[PDB]
Amino acid sequence: NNLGTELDYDTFCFYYDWYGSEAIDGQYRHWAHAIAPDPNGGSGQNPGTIPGTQESIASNFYPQLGRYSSSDPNILTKHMDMFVMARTGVLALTWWNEQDETEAKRIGLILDAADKKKIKVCFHLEPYPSRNVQNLRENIVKLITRYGNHPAFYRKDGKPLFFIYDSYLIEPSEWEKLLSPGGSITIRNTAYDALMIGLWTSSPTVQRPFILNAHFDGFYTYFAATGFTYGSTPTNWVSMQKWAKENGKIFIPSVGPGYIDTRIRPWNGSVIRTRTDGQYYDAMYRKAIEAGVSAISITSFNEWHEGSQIEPAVPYTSSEFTYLDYENREPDYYLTRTAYWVGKFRESK
């Protein structure tokens, strides 16, 4: 087929499976959430919590699917249909090393649901407690062993791919042991080799030698809010891609439709980026495509706390809060707009 509707498998969309319902999970997990104290406020703050009721959830937006469970097979089916609409071929699953049966179950359901729609799954490895290169190797081994034969397990030219959040918190001398072909616990040339994509945060002075000395295969930027870091300032992307190509590295800039997390972080208004009927999303996606990259990541499918989601949202006013919504656009606008940009990306690829 040459219909311009096919999934793109160099487009990665960051996906969260931490939502719960009382019925399926015992609690409206994540819909209920702590409110963070202001880092520059006093000692003795009592910020409180968001209860996760129908009226009051931990997002400035409101999901079309309501307070859904990430464990609900029928929610998962609808999410995969949304991925198909968006033409996003890879679901990049947040992985917090929860070490519990409920998460193991969710990962299996997600893989199965993805495969029904030809979607692929890769893992976004988060900074879990005591994360280090040894237990990272152990976890990489477990993931590849457990899921590597699943038809939905993502591979690029035969290799799995991992996004590593906050990679910069581990010294390059530690990464070398895992990621250099001569590293003492190397995954290179083993059954567990993978494309390792680290989080580029700050200036090239710092990030260039880090990426080289740590032996990352590439880098991504994550943050949906333009200007939050050097990496998430789209005017830097041309230069970042130039360096990536010069150094045999894979650059996967992250694009988002907007940002707002003030329900859970009321003091954090400076990071707000307004959606303006999709123009923000367009501008950011345009910059990624213009930089001439080979892959793009999307922040996010459903990080509802951060207001970066492309998942459909609906107008909602409760007694507790008046939510933001997609303004002059329909609930599925960010999905269909994603499909539009995937088309432009593929056109110049």
Automatic annotation (TrEMBL):
- Give the subcellular location: Golgi apparatus membrane
Q: Does this UniProt record's set of keywords contain Hydrolase?
A: yes
Q: Which InterPro entries match?
A: Glyco_Hydrolase_99
* Keywords on record: Golgi apparatus, Hydrolase, Membrane, Signal-anchor, Transmembrane, Transmembrane helix
Q: What is this protein called?
A: Glycosyl hydrolase family 71
Q: Name one Pfam family in it.
A: Glyco_hydro_99
Membrane topology field: Single-pass type II membrane protein
Name the source organism: Bacteroides xylanisolvens XB1A
Molecular function GO terms recorded: alpha-mannosidase activity
Predominant location: Golgi
What Gene3D superfamilies does this protein map onto? Answer: Glycosidases (3.20.20.80)
